[PDB]
Amino acid sequence: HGHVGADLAALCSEAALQAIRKKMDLIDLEDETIDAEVMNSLAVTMDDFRWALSQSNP
Amino acid sequence: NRPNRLIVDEAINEDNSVVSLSQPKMDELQLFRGDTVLLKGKKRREAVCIVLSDDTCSDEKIRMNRVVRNNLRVRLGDVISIQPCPDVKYGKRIHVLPIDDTVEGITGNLFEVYLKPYFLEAYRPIRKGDIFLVRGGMRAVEFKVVETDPSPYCIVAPDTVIHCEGEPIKREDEEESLNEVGYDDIGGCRKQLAQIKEMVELPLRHPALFKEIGVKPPRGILLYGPPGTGKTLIARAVANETGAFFFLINGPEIMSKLAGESESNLRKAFEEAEKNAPAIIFIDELDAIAPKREKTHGEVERRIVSQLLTLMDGLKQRAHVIVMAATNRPNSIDPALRRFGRFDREVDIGIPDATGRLEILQIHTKNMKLADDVDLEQVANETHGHVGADLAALCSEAALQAIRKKMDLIDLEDETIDAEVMNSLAVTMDDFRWALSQSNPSALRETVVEVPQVTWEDIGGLEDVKRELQELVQYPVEHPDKFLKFGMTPSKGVLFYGPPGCGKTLLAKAIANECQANFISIKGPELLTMWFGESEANVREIFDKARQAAPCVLFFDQLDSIAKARGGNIGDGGGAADRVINQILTEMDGMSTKKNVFIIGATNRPDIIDPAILRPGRLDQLIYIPLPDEKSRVAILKANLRKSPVAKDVDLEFLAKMTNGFSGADLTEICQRACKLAIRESIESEIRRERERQPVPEIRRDHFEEAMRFARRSVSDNDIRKYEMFAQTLQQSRGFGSFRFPS
Amino acid sequence: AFEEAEKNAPAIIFIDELDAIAPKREKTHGEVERRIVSQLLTLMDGLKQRAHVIVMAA
Ligand SMILES: Nc1ncnc2c1ncn2[C@@H]1O[C@H](COP(=O)(O)OP(=O)(O)OP(=O)(O)O)[C@@H](O)[C@H]1O
Ligand SMILES: Nc1ncnc2c1ncn2[C@@H]1O[C@H](COP(=O)(O)OP(=O)(O)O)[C@@H](O)[C@H]1O
Ligand SMILES: [Mg+2]
Numbered sequence: 054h055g056h057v058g059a060d061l062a063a064l065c066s067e068a069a070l071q072a073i074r075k076k077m078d079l080i081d082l083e084d085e086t087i088d089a090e091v092m093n094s095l096a097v098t099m100d101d102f103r104w105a106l107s108q109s110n111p
Numbered sequence: 112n113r114p115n116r117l118i119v120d121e122a123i124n125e126d127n128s129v130v131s132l133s134q135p136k137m138d139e140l141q142l143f144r145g146d147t148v149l150l151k152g153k154k155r156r157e158a159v160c161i162v163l164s165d166d167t168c169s170d171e172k173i174r175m176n177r178v179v180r181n182n183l184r185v186r187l188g189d190v191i192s193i194q195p196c197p198d199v200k201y202g203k204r205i206h207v208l209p210i211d212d213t214v215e216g217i218t219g220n221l222f223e224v225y226l227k228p229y230f231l232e233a234y235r236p237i238r239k240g241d242i243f244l245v246r247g248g249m250r251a252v253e254f255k256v257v258e259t260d261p262s263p264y265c266i267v268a269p270d271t272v273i274h275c276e277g278e279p280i281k282r283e284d285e286e287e288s289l290n291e292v293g294y295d296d297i298g299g300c301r302k303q304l305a306q307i308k309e310m311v312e313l314p315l316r317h318p319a320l321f322k323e324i325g326v327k328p329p330r331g332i333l334l335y336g337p338p339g340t341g342k343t344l345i346a347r348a349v350a351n352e353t354g355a356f357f358f359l360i361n362g363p364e365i366m367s368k369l370a371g372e373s374e375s376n377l378r379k380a381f382e383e384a385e386k387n388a389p390a391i392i393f394i395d396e397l398d399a400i401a402p403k404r405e406k407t408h409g410e411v412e413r414r415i416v417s418q419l420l421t422l423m424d425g426l427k428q429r430a431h432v433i434v435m436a437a438t439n440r441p442n443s444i445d446p447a448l449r450r451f452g453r454f455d456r457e458v459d460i461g462i463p464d465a466t467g468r469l470e471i472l473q474i475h476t477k478n479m480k481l482a483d484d485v486d487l488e489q490v491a492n493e494t495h496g497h498v499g500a501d502l503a504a505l506c507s508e509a510a511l512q513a514i515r516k517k518m519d520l521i522d523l524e525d526e527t528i529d530a531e532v533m534n535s536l537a538v539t540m541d542d543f544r545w546a547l548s549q550s551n552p553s554a555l556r557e558t559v560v561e562v563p564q565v566t567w568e569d570i571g572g573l574e575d576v577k578r579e580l581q582e583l584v585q586y587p588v589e590h591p592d593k594f595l596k597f598g599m600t601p602s603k604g605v606l607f608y609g610p611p612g613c614g615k616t617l618l619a620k621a622i623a624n625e626c627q628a629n630f631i632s633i634k635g636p637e638l639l640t641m642w643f644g645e646s647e648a649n650v651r652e653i654f655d656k657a658r659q660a661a662p663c664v665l666f667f668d669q670l671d672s673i674a675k676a677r678g679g680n681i682g683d684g685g686g687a688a689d690r691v692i693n694q695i696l697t698e699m700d701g702m703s704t705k706k707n708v709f710i711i712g713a714t715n716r717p718d719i720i721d722p723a724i725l726r727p728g729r730l731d732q733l734i735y736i737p738l739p740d741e742k743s744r745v746a747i748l749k750a751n752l753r754k755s756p757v758a759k760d761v762d763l764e765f766l767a768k769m770t771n772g773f774s775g776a777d778l779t780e781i782c783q784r785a786c787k788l789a790i791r792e793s794i795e796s797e798i799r800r801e802r803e804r805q806p807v808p809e810i811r812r813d814h815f816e817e818a819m820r821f822a823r824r825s826v827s828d829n830d831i832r833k834y835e836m837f838a839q840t841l842q843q844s845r846g847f848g849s850f851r852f853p854s
Numbered sequence: 855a856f857e858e859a860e861k862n863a864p865a866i867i868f869i870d871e872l873d874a875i876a877p878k879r880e881k882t883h884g885e886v887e888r889r890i891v892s893q894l895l896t897l898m899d900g901l902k903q904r905a906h907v908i909v910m911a912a
Contacts (some may be wrong), residue, residue: 059450059452060450060451061453062452063450063451063452063455065326066326066327066329066451069324069325069326070309070326071320072324073313073320073324073326074309076320077313081112081113081116083113083115083116084113086319086321087317087319092319092320092323095320095323095324096324097324098197106764283902286902286904287902290902361879361892363879363880363882363888364888364889364892366888367885367888368883368885371883399880585888768872
């Protein structure tokens with residue numbers, strides 16, 4: 054409602070980072086390179102955007 | 112959670128240059144005996160060794176000696192990953208430098224004594240930065256390989272030339288690596304360390320994930336908290352763990368009187384950081400350097416803020432440098448810094464809890480030698496509000512007290528101390544207790560108060576009141592899981608009202624010690640101020656300190672002073688008295704989550720207190736502290752005389768019968784009078800003992816009888832009716848009586 | 855001075871009128887004085903406590 058363009062950019066970044074967080078708990082975190090299948094499965098969804106909205110304040 | 116990951120294990124006979132792994136694990140790793148492999152360790156330290164097969168070694172463990180662990184800067188029980196080193200070839204040459212301290216006193220040539228037999232017909236792989244020990248000469252010498260040819264993986268063949276010429280390497284590098292600050296040296300900040308790790312380490316290691324999802328990692332991190340919580344510690348640990356240069360900026364350093372000097376300093380700092388990329392820019396006291404432009408009148412401050420905004424905007428140019436800041440009060444910072452592309456992510460570092468301060472104590476005491484008596488759990492428990500820096504200084508003071516004792520033993524004139532005295536040197540529990548006594552908590556360095564050491568047995572009677580007070584503080588903190596099962600939040604308010612001297616103030620002093628929770632005491636009118644908005648501002652500061660020091664007990668002694676019924680006075684001291692009550696109302700129950708802040712109020716006259724103060728949610732329980740009855744009067748006299756030696760002939764039970772309406776303080780005066788009479792008799796007796804030259808071990812019956820002649824009833828019968836009317840209004844307000852559900 | 859102190863370890867350092875050279879960094883007129891205080895702190899933190907050199911300030 055009161056979000057300036059910087060706030061919306063922060064929201065999009067937070068949603069993408071939340072998707073990356075979802076992919077965090079699966080990986081070993083010590084792998085030299087990440088698997089191609091989980092590389093392809095990574096995409097921003099509505100759940101990530103709603104989490105960002107819940108964590109979004111102007 | 113990979114086959115490469117293995118648990119650290121010791122070595123029975125395996126030496127430095129090789130490694131030994133269990134044969135099934137070697138087969139799982141597709142590794143043959145005699146193969147060269149790579150070891151990965153913490154702090155970005157690596158070594159190259161020959162893998163071996165051993166039946167003694169377990170499948171989940173890797174056999175390495177102490178020196179191999181010292182190479183990787185890792186301890187026993189750590190998790191490390193092993194990978195077969197690729198394309199390892201015989202070394203053309205190897206440049207080895209022994210430690211400078213070890214070479215001293217070695218008459219024979221270092222190379223011939225150590226290196227020539229060690230590498231003869233052995234083919235031992237080495238990487239740059241590897242240290243290996245060879246027994247020989249007068250003293251065992253550690254050799255550090257600064258240069259490897261070919262770098263970094265090479266095999267030392269007999270034909271490969273080995274030389275120890277040049278200035279021997281210093282132990283400073285080794286001790287700096289040992290003392291380098293990592294994530295493990297932070298205590299109580301694991302929840303915040305997770306977000307910091309996600310912000311910093313993840314983008315560096317897997318930028319492919321970010322490029323695939325098409326997002327860029329944040330560049331601004333704002334750590335805010337009380338001093339000593341380790342924000343600078345966390346920043347330096349992050350800088351060291353990621354192999355980035357740590358650059359420190361202090362707010363006073365940037366500040367300068369000359370025009371354009373502070374911004375030039377900031378630009379120079381950013382330029383040096385970008386040159387030393389990757390690097391971490393850390394700005395201590397960001398609040399002092401960058402306040403609100405509209406709020407500040409001085410031109411230089413908004414000048415610095417604008418320069419900082421420009422520097423942050425220009426920072427995001429793939430410079431691989433991340434700017435971090437530590438401040439006490441984030442709200443004092445210019446809001447333009449809080450936006451995205453700037454200090455967008457703010458991480459709250461708070462007062463460590465019991466387990467957090469236990470972790471801090473374990474971290475700082477890991478090098479100190481601890482006896483069996485000392486237990487760090489109780490040390491954490493008694494440190495109610497200490498911060499990490501306070502805990503470190505506390506451990507240092509306990510150690511220094513141990514040196515104080517061993518000094519009192521020793522003469523110090525001798526140049527060399529006997530080995531027996533050194534063997535006697537140790538650290539015990541009493542040293543830590545003394546450090547606890549001397550050290551003060553930074554959270555409450557303002558509200559520190561003396562402790563009369565009032566304990567429950569000091570209070571006589573009020574057993575029902577004592578039990579309720581403990582459950583108020585003990586239940587929510589010691590058993591929070593119980594409250595989540597039923598789902599209703601705990602009650603956090605009690606008002607004590609009654610005649611003066613019945614024990615309201617003792618219960619607050621006693622509750623401070625026993626429940627091991629932070630205790631803030633407000634003298635009744637202490638908060639009020641002559642300025643227009645300062646009386647209410649002091650109220651918000653008290654409730655903010657209590658929220659930061661949660662679990663905290665906020666004791667409002669003589670609550671009737673600041674909590675009056677609104678509208679009683681038109682002037683109300685200029686209307687400020689009502690505004691103080693309205694401020695108190697909002698903090699106790701307002702538009703915020705409730706922390707473990709337990710408000711306790713003691714008042715003589717409760718009927719004047721604002722009715723909004725006394726509703727459930729603010730001071731949930733109204734407890735009446737009456738005049739002690741006959742049974743309680745015995746307890747008060749027994750508790751008061753518990754310290755003093757009193758004759759067994761004294762019958763305390765009869766005193767309670769006679770003193771029908773005496774208060775707790777009145778009975779205390781009677782014992783005080785009896786003590787002075789017994790002291791006065793001793794003083795005159797010993798004077799007669801001196802006069803004849805030129806008795807009273809305990810208080811007898813006679814002193815009490817003379818004391819009772821001066822006994823008075825402090826609380827009048829008129830006042831007692833005033834207190835008993837109030838308790839009757841509560842009973843009549845409820846209605847009915849002996850409530851029971853039908854059948 | 856600190857280099858000579860570590861070179862001749864063990865050594866003893868005494869500073870006379872330290873407050874004259876090291877006022878409060880929050881309120882300091884000259885930048886040179888602030889840099890002197892910064893060098894004091896940097897040299898204090900630089901010693902790894904193996905120098906066994908005690909700095910005395912009056
Ligand atoms: N139940 C009690 N047991 C032991 N000592 C008591 C008791 N009640 C009162 N006293 C003694 O009375 C003195 C004052 O008591 P205290 O300060 O707790 O009273 P209070 O009811 O809070 O009074 P006030 O209304 O003046 O604030 C102390 O010496 C204390 O030891
Ligand atoms: N969470 C913590 N864990 C371990 N030690 C700590 C912690 N916080 C502070 N310390 C100790 O306090 C000392 C100084 O910390 P400091 O930089 O003053 O913290 P802050 O960033 O709050 O100013 C450090 O040497 C460290 O040993
Ligand atoms: Mg009192």
